[PDB]
């Protein structure tokens, strides 16, 4: 649908966009429709989508199977409350999630958004120790991590990124080990592994859980680390009895080349958070799974229950489109498509590493990252990308690609070629 | 869609429902479809819905205008990212919200769920004072209130209800004035008003905002208080420069008899949170509106922006069905329908007040509350209600009704008659 000149001014003057200023917002672009792997602007220009609307749209846009599953569930009921009620979409979705996740995970808590799913996992960890009579209130994690924007999640986000300086006096105080990415190109710094274990052993009676994003640290820097980290952290947790929360809201459903990034290490978390691509990026839904032991334990405390329940919990429409999205993944095609994207990204982004504006090129699965030596000029780059017929949304010192799995070769070539051109243009960087 | 015997056992064994135990959950009922004001169970029994799926389904179920608006937007695009992008559903929705809300409210932050909308409002208040160079980290509120389940919202929830005893060591410490409901039937206790003002004046340099649910306190007790509270709190805030956050996630869009419960007092908050009935209860969406002064101020600090941005922010599908829901309210019929429901609830619930199991009957708008002297036996009552052909979900000491605005007379009579019968049956109460 059409937008007037006055509509676009009203948006600028009244409508917040993610992490924007209301006094001096950068321009936005008017999208009318989306089809396959393309966004369609007012006036008809089509942009190849390089971002999958931030991870989630792994099957692209206007997918006929996802559309049909939504309209079918609307005909039955788009929503009914989940208190004292169950329904077929939630049951099928939770069957599918239990069946496809690492083996100890048996119990599913459906929720609205990724941030809430993390809050839920944190609350579960705290109720777990409360049922066991211990006062454990601290979470141990990596630097460079990202877990959401609500206050609980913010307290495990990296203490320089989320500007903790402003909320530190309000935000709960957690434990932050060295970032896992090696300091100079190696697989991992054993020193960083030893330093993680020292922090854990030093606070082992205060730590409720370790929380981390497995293999890829997303919004905190698109950083990629070795799976030895996960096998070793899993062993440490097992030795202490501490819970392991895996935040796969970004990595889940195939994007790093395995269905769940935990599979890279062959470990199972005690609590697993999912979101984003769960619905094929059609609408918001999240899920937090736990082991039987965790769920029974948090059923044993003085709570009598797990103390959480969103109004739209179990929403039939979102469950029904998540089911159709998961059914698309059951073809198994994603695993091959993602491997071929990975190989093309590695080959076509390599020339960028020669640029003086570029500090690193790194690829895993269908994630291609060009880390720059200076912050990007977002407005100038966005205009350039749109002029080239593509949609790429950089931030900070990162120009990165996470396209839909069904992207065609020439569409992906247009993305990598645009990125290579962008890093040669000094005007596209700030100071 | 159909559920097998084995599906229902899998739900019991694997699927959390709101505030449930995984070890001893109460039974749930299998819903296949919903139409008009009725839920349809497996096997075909139809239940009159007394709850509107917890506030939100004000137009009932399977509404043809809401269905058509969803399918139309699916054909265009169900979702695209909002970072650097705008679209027609978000613009129309934000135009409608600005136009219909109290006059200073001009800027709209769209989000995923009610809890996140509250977190957003709290973050806005904190960034506001940070931009003004003051360290204000405390929130002042009423006892008996409810604002959501994430950690930030939990810290303004009533300190006995949400079991703060478990999170108090993790949860931020806020200020809690006497509950507003009068102690013995009057309109208000001036002493409680004086005590609120003393707490504010005693901490006036630490208080970032007052947050409250206007007129009706929902999950914290379905309590109803006089509008003099709002006019006086608004005056106090104005005198100190303190922000007023109105949480209308439950009261917004007509349920208390006015479009927004703030209109009962004729006051405007600095920040207004909306949710639930926003989409007609078809799927989750929230919105937090602010004044121009707040938005520019939180654009002035060291942040450079408002530090929040959900992945599905601005979701076109949810915006499009919220637009259709708001267009239904533009008929103005809701205001008359709600007044007639109020009058029927008052007349038909009055006999319940004679019961020894009952402590109070209170009605406002399309909300009818029977407060009991002992906690309900939820399992036994739920079975009774379903046997009577209705859906009523009590909790604690509350049996209450919040039906869709389009409920028919005989449907509402069946609800009130079931409630009257339930409070005469000692078996339906626990110890």
User: What's the CA angle centered on A237, arms A235 and A239, to 5 degrees?
Assistant: 70
CA atoms within 13 A on the CB side of A429: 19
> Is A397 annotated in the active site?
no
CB A99 within 8 A of CB A272: no
B8 interfacial to chain A (CB closer than 8 Å): yes
CB A271 within 8 A of CB A234: no
State whether A320 and A366 are in the same domain.
no
Secondary structure class of B106 (helix, strand, coil): strand
Question: What are the start-end ranges of the H helices in B44-87?
Answer: 64-76
The CA distances from residue A292 to A254, A271, A296, in Å, are: 25, 10, 6
Alpha carbon distance B101, A5 (integer Å): 24
CB B374 within 8 A of CB B430: yes
State whether A175 and A313 are in the same domain.
yes
Q: Domain range for residue B373?
A: 1-62+333-429
Instruction: Give the burial string for A242-256 (b: 16+ CB within 10 Å, else e).
Output: bbbbbbbbbbbbbbb
Contact residues, chain A, for B18 at CB < 8 Å:
82-83, 308-310, 313
Alpha carbon distance A237, A241 (integer Å): 6
A235 interfacial to chain B (CB closer than 8 Å): no
CB B13 within 8 A of CB B2: no
Contact residues, chain A, for B378 at CB < 8 Å:
84
Alpha carbon distance A174, A6 (integer Å): 47
State whether A183 and A206 are in the same domain.
yes
State whether B120 and B265 are in the same domain.
yes
Alpha carbon distance A389, A11 (integer Å): 23
Beta bridge partners of B247: B273
Secondary structure class of B368 (helix, strand, coil): strand
Domain harbouring B341, CATH code: 3.90.1150.10
Method used to determine the 3D structure? X-ray
CB A110 within 8 A of CB B16: yes
Cβ partners under 8 Å of residue A266, min gap 6 = A227, A231
Pick among A17, A158, A395 to test the B interface (most B CBs inside 10 A) = A17
CB B392 within 8 A of CB B399: yes
3-state secondary structure chain A: CCCCHHHHHHHHHHECCCCCCCCCCCCCEEEEEEEECEEEECCCCEEEECCCCCCCCCCCECCHHHHHHHHHHHHHCCCCCCCCEECHHHHHHHHHHHHHCCCCEEEEEEECCHHHHHHHHHHHHHHHHHHCCCCCCEEEEECCCCCCCCHHHHCCCCCCCCCHHHHCCCCCCCEEECCCCCCCCCCCCHHHHHHHHHHHHHCCCCEEEEEECCCEECCCCCEECCCHHHHHHHHHHHHHCCEEEEECCCCCCCCCCCCCHHHHCCCCCCEEEECHHHHCCCCCCEEEEEEHHHHHHHHHCCCCCCCCCCCCCCCHHHHHHHHHHHHHHCCCHHHHHHHHHHHHHHHHHHHHHHCCCEEEEEEECCEEEEEECCCECHHHHHHHHHHCCEECCCECCEEEECCCCCCCHHHHHHHHHHHHHHCCCHHHECC
B37 interfacial to chain A (CB closer than 8 Å): no
Contact residues, chain A, for B170 at CB < 8 Å:
126, 137, 172
Q: Select which of B96, B123, B276, B397 is catalytic.
A: B276
Total number of domains in chain A:
2
Q: What is the resolution of this structure in A?
A: 1.8
CB B152 within 8 A of CB B124: no
Alpha carbon distance B318, B323 (integer Å): 9
Cβ-nearest to A88 among B2, B28, B108: B2
State whether A120 and A238 are in the same domain.
yes
Pick among B36, B137, B150 to test the A interface (most A CBs inside 10 A) = B150
Torsional sign, CA B132, B135, B141, B147? positive
User: Which one, of A165, A138, A140, A173, lies nearest residue B172 by Cα?
Assistant: A173
Q: Select which of B49, B189, B247, B270 is catalytic.
A: B247
User: Which one, of B407, B315, B320, B276, lies nearest residue B67 by Cα?
Assistant: B320
Overall residue count recorded for chain A in this entry? 431
CB A326 within 8 A of CB A96: yes
CB B349 within 8 A of CB B372: no
Cβ-nearest to B84 among A29, A112, A172: A29
State whether A289 and A216 are in the same domain.
yes
Q: Which of B276, B308, B332 is the last residue of a domain?
A: B332
Q: Do B82 and A170 touch (CB under 8 A)?
A: no
Alpha carbon distance A317, A71 (integer Å): 9
User: Which one, of A85, A16, A118, lies nearest residue A312 by Cα?
Assistant: A85
Cβ partners under 8 Å of residue B347, min gap 6 = none
Q: Select which of A61, A146, A225, A405 is catalytic.
A: A146
Beta bridge partners of A367: A364
Alpha carbon distance B36, B47 (integer Å): 11
Q: Which of A300, A332, A364 is the last residue of a domain?
A: A332
Domain harbouring B233, CATH code: 3.40.640.10
A109 interfacial to chain B (CB closer than 8 Å): yes
Alpha carbon distance B182, B189 (integer Å): 5
State whether B399 and B265 are in the same domain.
no
Secondary structure class of B69 (helix, strand, coil): helix
DSSP secondary-structure letter at B178? P
State whether B187 and B213 are in the same domain.
yes
DSSP secondary-structure letter at B255? T
Overall residue count recorded for chain B in this entry? 431
Q: Which of A332, A362, A397 is the last residue of a domain?
A: A332
State whether A308 and A167 are in the same domain.
yes
Beta bridge partners of A216: A224
CB B222 within 8 A of CB B371: yes
Instruction: Tell me phi and psi for residue B141, to 5 degrees.
Output: -150, 175
CB A247 within 8 A of CB A78: no
DSSP secondary-structure letter at B308? -
- B46-49, strands of its sheet edge to edge: A85-86, B29-35, B38-41, B46-49, B390-391
State whether A191 and A324 are in the same domain.
yes
User: Which one, of A223, A373, A311, A161, lies nearest residue B149 by Cα?
Assistant: A311
């Amino acid at each position: 649908q059409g937008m007037t000149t006055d509509d676009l001014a009203f948006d600028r003057r009244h409508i917040w966009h993610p992490y924007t200023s209301m006094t001096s917002p950068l321009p936005v672009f008017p999208v009318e429709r989306a089809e396959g792997c393309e966004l369609i602007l007012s006036g008809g220009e089509r942009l190849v989508d390089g971002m999958s609307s931030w991870w989630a749209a792994i099957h692209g846009y206007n997918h006929p199977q996802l559309n049909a599953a939504m309209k079918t569930q609307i005909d039955a009921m788009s929503h009914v409350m989940f208190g004292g009620i169950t329904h077929a979409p939630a049951i099928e979705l939770c069957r599918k999630l239990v069946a496809m996740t690492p083996a100890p995970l048996e119990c599913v808590f459906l929720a609205d958004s990724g941030s809430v799913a993390v809050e839920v996992a944190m609350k579960m960890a705290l109720q777990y120790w409360q049922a066991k009579g211990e006062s454990r209130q601290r979470f141990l994690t990596f630097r460079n991590g990202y877990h959401g924007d609500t206050f609980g999640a913010m307290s495990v986000c990296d203490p320089h990124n989320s500007m903790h300086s402003l909320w530190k006096g309000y935000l709960a105080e957690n434990l932050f080990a060295p970032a896992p990415q090696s300091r100079m190109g190696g697989e991992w710094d054993e020193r960083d592994m030893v330093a993680f274990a020292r922090l854990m052993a030093a606070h082992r009676h205060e730590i409720a859980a370790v929380i981390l994003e497995p293999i890829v640290q997303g919004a905190g820097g698109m950083r990629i680390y070795h799976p030895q980290w996960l096998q070793r952290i899993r062993q440490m947790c097992d030795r202490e009895g501490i819970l392991l929360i895996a935040d796969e809201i970004a990595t889940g459903f195939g994007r790093t080349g395995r269905l769940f990034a935990c599979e890279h290490a062959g470990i199972a978390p005690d609590i697993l958070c999912l979101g984003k691509a769960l619905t094929g990026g059609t609408m918001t839904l999240s899920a937090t799974l736990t082991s039987r032991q965790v769920a029974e334990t948090i059923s044993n405390g003085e709570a009598g229950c797990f103390m959480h329940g969103p109004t739209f919990m179990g929403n039939p429409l979102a469950c029904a489109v998540a089911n159709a999205s998961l059914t698309l993944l059951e073809s198994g095609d994603w695993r091959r498509q993602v491997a071929a994207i990975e190989a093309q990204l590695r080959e076509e982004l390599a020339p960028a590493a020669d640029s003086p504006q570029v500090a690193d090129v790194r690829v895993l699965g269908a994630i291609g990252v060009v880390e720059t030596t200076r912050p990007v000029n977002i407005a100038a780059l966005q205009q350039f990308f749109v002029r080239q017929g593509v949609w790429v949304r950089p931030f900070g010192k990162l120009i990165y690609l996470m396209p839909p799995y069904i992207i065609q070769p020439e569409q992906l070539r247009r993305l990598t070629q645009a990125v290579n051109e962008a890093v040669r243009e000094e005007t596209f960087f700030s100071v």
